[PDB]
Every structure is written in structure tokens, then in C-alpha cells.
Amino acid sequence: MKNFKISSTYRAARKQQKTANRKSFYNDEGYMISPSEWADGVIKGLINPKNSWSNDHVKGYLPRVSPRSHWTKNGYREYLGIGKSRDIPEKEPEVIEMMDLELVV
């Protein structure tokens, strides 16, 4: 994930909805566990501490992610993925002949 970054609106929403203050923890099978047993499993090695917790939920359907920018050769700004998005029109499509087909109104 390099073309996009975390949006500032979502970061502000998460910050002052305090969703990181209400984390949920999981064991290696992805089942909700109390923070005490999560700590005990992480210390024992039975849980990977990295991918085993969630930052609650942010409400309001905000865009989580915004395009990231970089510097072109002349010092102008540009979106990272705008210019290397595509080069060929992928050929396609295929026009299948299906004149014998009863459509439904």
C-alpha cells in the first residue's frame, strides 16, 4: 500500500471517537478474548501480537483513504497512480450472438 494513504478526516474521526481506546483482542483462531488472556497468549507465543486486535469501529461512512502524492522530475506534485494506471485498452469485449433468448420485461 503505497499509492494511497490514510485520510486526515478518518484519522480525526478515529482520534476523537476514541475507537483505539476500545480494542478487541483475538487468539490465533480469530476468536474474541479478554485482554488478560490475549497478553498471556502473546507472552507464551501462542498469539501473534501484530494481527490479533481491532480498533473498534468508526461511524459515518467516511472515506478511510486518500490518494498519495509524489514529486515529478520538474518539481511538480502528482498523484502516485494517476500516470502509471494503464497503457493498453485490454483489447476486449466479445459480442456473443444470443438472438434466441426470451427476455423478461
Binding site: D28, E29, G45, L46, I47, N48
Partner: protein, 130 residues
């Protein structure tokens, strides 16, 4: 020198599956679903050994061997951040491949299929799951 004889294969299966890896709760990591295809192929080979001659069943044993190796290499169970391979453990602790190498006629083939019968029987006896 053969590892399977008519006087020891049931006890051999006993010892082989009493040594299978277990979870910290004591349950077997192997399940019948992981060895269902192997059991079906062994049953079909036993059925077909009665009618047809051994020279006709020369590809079936080879398919059974490649299925054993494939299933032992592909089946994995991950618990507590540890990955075990129960079918490979069963194959090495039961000497399935070495017994398959000693199949040369109807008698040895039927003895091997009865040995697999005994293996799954005793696996179910000690709390094996479907």
C-alpha cells in the same frame, strides 16, 4: 524381511497410532476427513484384488502411493501458531510407504489393506474425529 506380517499388523497399527501427535488438550490432530480418499482407494484396491490378477493392479498401487505422498504433503493443521501435518505423521509412524514398497502379489496387497483397516480402526478407538 517384511515390516507387515499376519501376526503383527494389528499390534503394529496399535503402536503406530498411539504415537500420533496430540493437541495440548489431548485430542488427535488427525481427522478422518484428511484420510478419506486414501481409505476409499485402499478399500477399492482390496475389493479389486479378489477378482483381478496382480499384474492388472499395477497402476492402482502406484496411484495409491502417489495419493499417499500428496495427502501427507498437503494436509496441515495449525493450532497455537504451530503447524503440524497429521497425515505425514501417520504415514511415517505407520511406515505406510515402506509397506507399500513390499507389495508384490495379492497376499501382500491384502495384508497392507488390512493394515490400513487396523490403523483407522484403532484411530477411531482412541477418540479420532470425523
Amino acid at each position: 524381511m517384511a515390516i507387515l506380517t499376519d501376526e503383527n499388523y494389528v499390534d503394529k497399527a496399535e503402536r503406530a497410532i498411539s504415537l500420533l501427535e496430540k493437541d495440548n488438550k489431548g485430542n488427535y490432530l488427525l481427522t478422518t476427513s484428511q484420510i478419506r480418499k486414501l481409505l476409499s482407494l485402499c478399500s477399492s484396491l482390496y475389493d479389486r484384488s479378489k477378482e483381478r490378477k496382480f499384474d492388472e493392479l499395477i497402476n492402482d498401487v502406484s496411484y495409491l502411493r502417489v495419493q499417499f505422498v500428496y495427502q501427507s504433503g498437503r494436509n496441515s493443521v495449525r493450532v497455537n501458531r504451530q503447524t503440524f501435518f497429521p497425515v505425514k505423521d501417520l504415514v511415517e509412524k505407520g511406515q505406510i510407504l515402506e509397506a507399500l514398497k513390499e507389495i508384490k502379489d495379492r497376499e501382500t496387497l491384502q495384508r497392507f489393506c488390512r493394515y490400513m483397516e487396523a490403523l483407522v480402526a484403532y484411530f477411531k478407538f482412541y477418540g479420532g474425529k470425523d
